[model samples]
Target: MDKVQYLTRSAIRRASTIEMPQQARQNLQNLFINFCLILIFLLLICIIVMLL
Candidate 1:
């Protein structure tokens, strides 16, 4: 009985810590994609267009 209760509480705490807010997740994804795009753009800029 007490052992089950302890296990349940530990599980709940672990789940809560692992859970994330939708907005935060969206922001993280957007930041990653934007950084990827910026890197690609920077690489493009490094290429010379028509030799000047």
Candidate 2:
């Protein structure tokens, strides 16, 4: 509605989706992997405790 030219409706629709940077995406995946490793360690400890 303003005097801007690039602020058209289609551009607004295309830009509205959730977006993430490259480093942040890698960090999120790393977090999941570390979380899995932690859970595996905890499970091993619990198994040892049960065996003893």
Candidate 3:
């Protein structure tokens, strides 16, 4: 088989177990993102209050 054929088959073989379910992955990602945003907002407020 050519290089393309081999790569395609190899990907199809491992697609099931290589990555978590897409929805679960996105949910975790969003949770982390929101946590980071809240942390930044608090830090910004902290800096302003300290300066005042």
Candidate 4:
């Protein structure tokens, strides 16, 4: 690699993910909660053999 390319690349010593902003975080939380709610509701029906 050339000097310019080496200098232009970002320096990273670790692998990690960053947190989302408030709005995006709220949306993600809501999505997960709604998914869990739906999953549990479906599981209840399944236990009763209530397939539709």
Error of 2 at 50 (Å): 2.2
Candidate 1: segments with Cα more than 4 A from true spot = 1-20
lDDT of 3 by residue, 1-52 (tens): 6898989876755673355466555666888889999988988989879999
Summarize candidate 4's per-residue lDDT along 1-52 as a digit string, tens digits.
6775655443221211233344555666788889999978987978668655
Worst 10 residues of 2 by lDDT: 12-21
RMSD of 2: 9.6
Which segments of model 3 are wrong by more than 4 Å? 1-20
Tens digits of lDDT, candidate 2, 4-40: 6556654544444334355555756888889999978
Backbone collision tally, model 3: 0
Which of the numbered candidates is closest to the native, going by highest lDDT? 3
Give the TM-score (vs. native) of candidate 4. 0.41
**Candidate 2 residue pairs that clash:** none
Candidates' TM-scores?
Answer: 0.47, 0.46, 0.43, 0.41
Q: Model-by-model lDDT, in order?
A: 0.74, 0.67, 0.75, 0.60
Q: Deviation in angstroms for 12 in model 1?
A: 22
List runs of model 4 lying over 4 Å from the truth. Answer: 1-20, 47-52
lDDT of 3: 0.75
